[PDB]
Design a protein around this ligand. Structure first.
Ligand SMILES: CC(C)C[C@H](N)C(=O)NS(=O)(=O)OC[C@H]1O[C@@H](n2cnc3c(N)ncnc32)[C@H](O)[C@@H]1O
Length: 1002
C-alpha cells in the first residue's frame, strides 16, 4: 500500500513542477518562429458533464495522451487541448427532477430517485439543494473534471479549456458564427420531417439523449383502412352513423388484391379513436399515439378515444377492403399476433403469407374455434386464397404449397412457419410476378409503390411511420415517430455527401472496419434534426426559441481550441477578462470569418489588427486536426457530422479537413462490463486513488489497441505498481554504487549482446509507437526491455558495465515516459540531468547484430536444457558441440534445402519428404530418426525463420559456451564444465550431436 502512496507523492510533486514551469502551454507565435519538425494537433471529444469522468473516458483519452508523449520526443510540437461538453438535456433533466423533490417534499424528501444518487456521490445534505438549477452543475462538475485530469498528468494546455452552453459567451458566439455560415450556404433548412420523437420531452430524440437503440430511425408502413359495414358489431352500436375503419399495417401492399379476411387478436385491447376528419380508427394505443404525432388526429399527441374493446368483441364484423376481389371480408381471430409491431390488426393474404392460410385452415378444420369466437360458416368457408403473385419455384399460391409441403396444421408451429416464411421471404420481393388485371406480368419491385399510391389516392390507405425497434429516452419515455417541423442539417445532399466521401478517402482510419463503419453511416445518412426546445446550449441566432442539440454544436469546435487561450484564457465559463482584451460580443460573424477563413477580408471592428492577426496565426498554424481518438460509438454520429461540417465550413481547403480518426473499444473492467449497477465501476479519481496516475496509466497502456473491447485488469495494475517500485529501487541502487560498476571499454560478449538487444528494443518500440500499438510498445519497451536487462545482469559474471547500465536506464526512462511520465521525470532528475525529461529527445539506436541475439537465444536454450537434465542423474559436466551436421542429418537437411529453394520456401508434405528420403540408399539405418528430424526442422523453421536451414551456425558455438562456462558452472552448482568438439565424443554422442543442440553428460 505504501508503494502506491510513494507513487502518488512523486506524482503530486512532479505535477506541481510541471504546472509552475508551464511546460505544456504552447503558443503559435513562439513555435512558428522555430521550425522544428512539425505540429501535432490531437483531440479527444469533450465529455458530457452530467457526472464525474470514469475509467472509460480515461482509456479513450489515453490514446492521444500517449500519442503526444511519444511525438514530443520525436521533435514535434504538440497541442492536446481539452474542452468540456455541457450542451444537452440530461443535466437540466436531472436538475429539474431534483427540484421536483425539493419543492414537492423537503430536505431530505419523505418517500414514498435523483436525491439518492446525489447523496451517493457523497454530497452534503445542504449542498444538493444548490443542484436544483443547472448553473450549479456547470459550476461544479467541470472544475472537478479539470482537477482529475490534471491529477492524472495529461500534457494539456489548460489555457484553452472551455464550456459549451450559452453560459459561455465566446463559445456561444463561435456556435452562432458556425450556424450562420451554415444557413448562408444552404446547409441548415427549416421543414416538416419524420423523426424519432420524445413526447415527454417535446423534441426529436437523437442519439445522445437516448437509452435504447442508439441508431434506430423510423420505418414506413402502408396503413390500409377497412371500412366496417353495417350491421356494426354489438360493441360499436353507439357509433352508428359514423364511418369506422380497421387500420392495418403492412409492408407488401401489392398483395392486397388477395384479401380473404382480417385477423385480430381476440385477447388484445383495441382502441377506436376519432381522427382529424371525424372518422373512427380501430387500432391499438401505441399505434394511435404514433398516428397522433403523425398528424392523424385533430390535435398533436391528443388521442380522442371513443371506444375501448377487445378483439373478441370485433370478431365476425363485416369489412370492405381495398383492391381485393371479395366485396365483404370478415374479422377473424388469430392467436399469434405480436403487440409490438404495427396496429395489432393484420390482413389475410392466404396466398402468399403462411400465417394467414394457417389460421384460415385452423378455422376451417373444427367447430371449436368458430364456436369459441362466434364465427359462423359465412365468415370462413366461402373464402379461398386468391392467386395474385406467382413465384416461379412455387406457383400462384406460394404459401399454400410450401405449407402443404412442410405439413403444417396449426398457426402455432413457430418453427415450421418461420422456416416457410424464410423460404419465400425475399423470393417475392424480386422473382414475384403480378397476375391481377392492370398489372399482369409485371415485376413486383416495379409496381408495389404504384399500387400503394393507387390506394393512397383513393383514400383507401395512408402512410404510417413507426420506430423499427423500441427506443427509450433518457427521461424514460418511449419514443414515437413524429412528422414535426424543425431545423435540420441537410446531410442528404448529393454534393455534400460526395465531398465528404472524398474527405473520407483522404481520412486515415487505422483499420478497414472503421472505414466500413464510416461508409455505411455515410450512405445511410440523411436529414438530421438539430433543433431542441428543452435543454442547455446555444439557441439558433435567428430563431432564438430553438436550442441546438449536443450532436450539432460539436462538429468544428476544434478550431475554437486554437484561440480559446487568447479569447477567455483558462476561465471555463469565459466570465473573466480576455488576455487580448477582446470583448465577448465584439466577435462578429465577419470577425470569425477573418479568424478562420484565409481569404477573408479584415472587417470593420474596434479590435486592433494585432489581436485578430494573432488569433488567425494560432488557427492557421495548429489546423488541421492531426488525430481524433474516440470510442467506436461516436463513428455513426458525431465523427460523421465532424467530417460533414469540416467539408461545409472550409469547402475549398481540403488541407484543413481532418487527417486521422482512431476508434477504440469500450473499456471492460476485470473482463466484465463496467456498470455501477453491478458494483464493477471506477471513476478517474477513484482509479488514481487506487493505482496512482502512473500505475493506472500503465495498466491502461496494456488495456487494448484494437477496436475490440479493451480490458483494464486490476491485478495487472498491481503487478505493474510492484515492478515500477522495484525499478526505481534498482535505479537508486545503481546510482549509489556508481563506482562499484566495471568501467573501461565495453568489450565483453555480454556487453555486446546487451547493447544489441537494447538497440533492437529501441527500434521495435519506436515502430510500435508510430503504429499506436501502445500495448505492443509497452511489451517491447518495458517488459522485454526489463527482460534484457535482467538477463544481462544474470550473465555478467565480472559485474555489469557502468556505461551500459546507465545507457539502459536513460533509454528505458525515455521509452517508458509517455506511459509513466511522473516516475520517468523523477528518475530523470535522479540521474542528475539538467533539464526536464519533457525536453529530451527520442533515444538513438546503435547497431543491431542479429548474430549476437541469436547466439544469446542459443545460450538461453542451452542453459535451460542443462538445468532440465540436472533434475536426475553431480560435480563435473561434459558438453559436446557439433561443428557440422552428421552425415544422415546433413543429407536430409540438404534435401529440405533443395525443396525450400525450389518453390519460394514451401516445404512439401511429410508424405513426399519421407518418400524421397526412403528412396535414398544411404538412409537405410536411419529412416526411423529421419522424420522426427524433419519435424524438428519444420517446427524451428516456423518458429525462428529460415536460418535453421543453414548447414552451419552463423556464430562460433563453442566460443559462445566458453564465454559463459563460469556462469554455467556457478548456476548448475557444479565444479567443472568441459566443452569438447564432439569428435572426442563416443559413438552415440558423436553420431547424434548436431550443431545448435549440444549434448552433455554430468
Ligand atoms: C463531441 C461530442 C458529440 C461528444 C459527446 N460529448 C460525448 O460522447 N461525451 S462522453 O462522455 O459520453 O464520451 C466522450 C469520449 O469518451 C468515449 N467513451 C465514453 N464512455 C466510454 C467507455 N465506457 N469505454 C471506452 N470509451 C468511452 C466516447 O466514445 C467519446 O470518444
Amino acid at each position: 500500500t505504501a508503494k502506491v502512496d510513494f507513487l502518488k507523492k512523486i506524482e503530486k510533486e512532479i505535477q506541481q513542477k510541471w504546472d509552475t514551469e508551464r511546460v505544456f502551454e504552447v503558443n503559435a507565435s513562439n513555435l512558428e518562429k522555430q521550425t522544428s519538425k512539425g505540429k501535432y494537433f490531437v483531440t479527444f471529444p469533450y465529455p458530457y458533464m452530467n457526472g464525474r469522468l470514469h475509467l472509460g473516458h480515461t482509456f479513450s483519452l489515453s490514446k492521444c495522451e500517449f500519442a503526444v508523449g511519444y511525438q514530443r520526443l520525436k521533435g514535434k510540437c504538440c497541442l492536446f487541448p481539452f474542452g468540456l461538453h455541457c450542451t444537452g438535456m440530461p443535466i437540466k433533466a436531472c436538475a429539474d427532477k431534483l427540484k421536483r423533490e425539493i419543492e414537492l417534499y423537503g430536505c431530505p424528501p419523505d418517500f414514498p430517485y435523483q436525491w439518492g444518487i446525489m447523496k451517493s456521490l457523497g454530497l452534503s445534505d445542504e449542498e444538493i439543494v444548490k443542484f436544483s438549477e443547472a448553473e450549479h452543475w456547470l459550476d461544479y462538475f467541470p472544475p472537478l473534471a479539470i482537477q482529475d485530469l490534471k491529477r492524472m498528468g495529461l500534457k494539456v494546455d489548460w489555457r484553452r479549456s472551455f464550456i459549451t452552453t450559452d453560459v459561455n459567451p465566446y463559445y456561444d458566439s463561435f456556435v452562432r458564427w458556425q450556424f450562420l455560415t451554415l444557413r448562408e450556404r444552404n446547409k441548415i433548412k427549416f421543414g416538416k420531417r419524420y423523426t424519432i420523437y420524445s413526447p415527454k420531452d417535446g423534441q426529436p430524440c437523437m442519439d445522445h439523449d437516448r437509452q435504447t437503440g442508439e441508431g434506430v430511425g423510423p420505418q414506413e408502413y402502408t396503413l390500409l383502412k377497412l371500412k366496417v359495414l353495417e350491421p356494426y358489431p354489438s360493441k360499436l352500436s353507439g357509433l352508428k352513423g359514423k364511418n369506422i375503419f380497421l387500420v392495418a399495417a403492412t409492408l407488401r401492399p401489392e398483395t392486397m388484391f388477395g384479401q380473404t379476411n382480417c385477423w385480430v387478436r381476440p385477447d388484445m385491447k383495441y382502441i377506436g379513436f376519432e381522427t382529424v376528419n371525424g372518422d373512427i380508427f380501430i387500432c391499438t394505443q401505441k399505434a394511435a399515439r404514433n398516428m397522433s404525432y403523425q398528424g392523424f388526429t385533430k390535435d398533436n399527441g391528443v388521442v380522442p378515444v371513443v371506444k375501448e374493446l377487445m378483439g373478441e368483441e370485433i370478431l365476425g364484423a363485416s369489412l370492405s377492403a381495398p383492391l381485393t376481389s371479395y366485396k365483404v371480408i370478415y374479422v377473424l381471430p388469430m392467436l399469434t399476433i405480436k403487440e409490438d409491431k404495427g396496429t395489432g390488426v393484420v390482413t389475410s393474404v392466404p396466398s402468399d403469407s403462411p400465417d394467414d392460410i394457417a389460421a384460415l385452415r385452423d378455422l376451417k378444420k373444427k367447430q371449436a374455434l368458430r364456436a369459441k369466437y362466434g364465427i359462423r360458416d359465412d365468415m370462413v368457408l366461402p373464402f379461398e386464397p386468391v392467386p395474385v403473385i406467382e413465384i416461379p419455384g412455387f406457383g400462384n399460391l406460394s404459401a399454400v404449397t410450401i405449407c402443404d409441403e412442410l405439413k403444417i396444421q396449426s398457426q402455432n408451429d413457430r418453427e415450421k412457419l418461420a422456416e416457410a416464411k424464410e423460404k419465400i421471404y425475399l423470393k417475392g420481393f424480386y422473382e414475384g410476378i403480378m397476375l391481377v388485371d392492370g398489372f399482369k406480368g409485371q415485376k413486383v419491385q416495379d409496381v408495389k409503390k404504384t399500387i400503394q399510391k393507387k390506394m393512397i389516392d383513393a383514400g383507401d390507405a395512408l402512410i404510417y411511420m413507426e420506430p423499427e425497434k423500441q427506443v427509450m429516452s433518457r427521461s424514460s419515455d418511449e419514443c414515437v415517430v413524429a412528422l414535426c417541423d424543425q431545423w435540420y442539417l441537410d446531410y442528404g445532399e448529393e454534393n455534400w455527401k460526395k465531398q465528404t466521401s472524398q474527405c473520407l478517402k483522404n481520412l486515415e482510419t487505422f483499420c478497414e472496419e472503421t472505414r466500413r463503419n464510416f461508409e455505411a453511416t455515410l450512405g445511410w445518412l440523411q436529414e438530421h434534426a438539430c433543433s431542441r426546445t428543452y435543454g442547455l446550449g446555444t439557441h439558433l441566432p435567428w430563431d432564438e426559441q430553438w436550442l441546438i442539440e449536443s450532436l450539432s454544436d460539436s462538429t468544428i469546435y476544434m478550431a475554437f481550441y486554437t484561440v480559446a487561450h487568447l479569447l477567455q484564457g483558462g476561465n471555463l465559463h469565459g466570465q473573466a477578462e480576455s488576455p487580448l482584451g477582446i470583448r465577448p460580443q465584439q466577435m462578429t460573424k465577419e470577425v470569425w470569418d477573418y479568424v478562420f477563413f484565409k481569404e477573408a477580408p479584415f472587417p470593420k471592428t474596434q479590435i486592433a489588427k494585432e489581436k485578430l492577426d494573432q488569433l488567425k496565426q494560432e488557427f492557421e498554424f495548429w489546423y488541421p486536426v492531426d488525430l481524433r481518438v474516440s470510442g467506436k460509438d461516436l463513428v455513426p454520429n458525431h465523427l460523421s457530422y465532424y467530417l460533414y461540417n469540416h467539408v461545409a465550413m472550409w469547402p475549398e481547403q481540403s488541407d484543413k479537413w481532418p487527417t486521422a480518426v482512431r476508434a477504440n473499444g469500450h473499456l471492460l473492467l476485470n473482463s466484465e462490463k463496467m456498470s455501477k449497477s453491478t458494483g464493477n465501476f471506477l471513476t478517474l479519481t477513484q482509479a488514481i486513488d487506487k493505482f496512482s496516475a502512473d500505475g493506472m496509466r500503465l495498466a491502461l497502456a496494456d488495456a487494448g489497441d484494437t477496436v475490440e473491447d479493451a480490458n483494464f485488469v486490476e491485478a495487472m495494475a498491481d503487478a505493474g505498481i510492484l515492478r515500477l517500485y522495484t525499478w526505481v529501487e534498482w535505479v537508486k541502487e545503481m546510482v549509489a554504487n556508481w563506482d562499484s560498476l566495471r568501467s573501461g571499454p565495453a568489450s565483453t560478449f555480454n556487453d555486446r549482446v546487451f547493447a544489441s538487444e537494447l538497440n533492437a528494443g529501441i527500434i521495435k518500440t519506436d515502430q510500435n509507437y508510430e503504429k499506436m500499438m501502445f500495448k505492443e510498445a509497452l511489451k517491447t519497451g518495458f517488459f522485454e526491455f526489463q527482460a534484457a536487462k535482467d538477463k544481462y545482469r544474470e550473465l555478467a559474471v565480472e559485474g555489469m558495465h557502468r556505461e551500459l547500465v546507465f545507457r539502459f536506464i536513460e533509454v528505458q526512462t525515455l521509452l517508458l515516459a509517455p506511459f509513466c511520465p511522473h516516475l520517468c521525470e523523477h528518475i530523470w532528475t535522479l540521474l542528475g540531468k539538467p533539464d526536464s525529461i519533457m525536453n529530451a529527445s527520442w533515444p538513438v539506436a546503435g547497431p543491431v547484430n542479429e548474430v549476437l541475439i541469436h547466439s544469446s537465444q542459443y545460450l538461453m536454450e542451452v542453459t535451460h536444457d542443462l538445468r532440465l537434465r540436472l533434475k536426475n542423474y553431480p560435480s563435473h559436466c561434459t558438453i559436446y558441440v557439433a561443428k557440422n551436421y552428421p552425415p544422415w542429418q546433413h543429407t536430409t537437411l540438404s534435401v529440405l534445402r533443395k525443396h525450400f529453394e525450389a518453390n519460394n520456401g514451401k516445404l512439401p508434405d511429410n508424405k513426399v519428404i519421407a518418400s524421397e528420403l526412403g528412396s535414398m540408399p544411404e538412409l537405410k539405418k536411419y529412416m526411423k530418426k529421419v522424420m522426427p528430424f524433419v519435424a524438428m526442422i519444420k517446427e524451428n523453421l516456423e518458429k525462428m525463420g529460415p536460418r535453421i536451414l543453414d548447414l552451419q551456425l552463423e556464430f562460433d558455438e563453442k566460443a559462445v559456451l566458453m564465454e559463459n562456462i563460469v556462469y554455467l558452472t556457478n548456476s548448475l552448482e557444479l565444479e567443472h564444465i568441459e566443452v569438447k568438439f564432439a569428435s572426442e565424443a563416443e559413438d552415440k554422442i558423436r553420431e547424434d550431436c548436431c550443431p545448435g543442440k549440444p549434448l552433455n553428460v554430468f
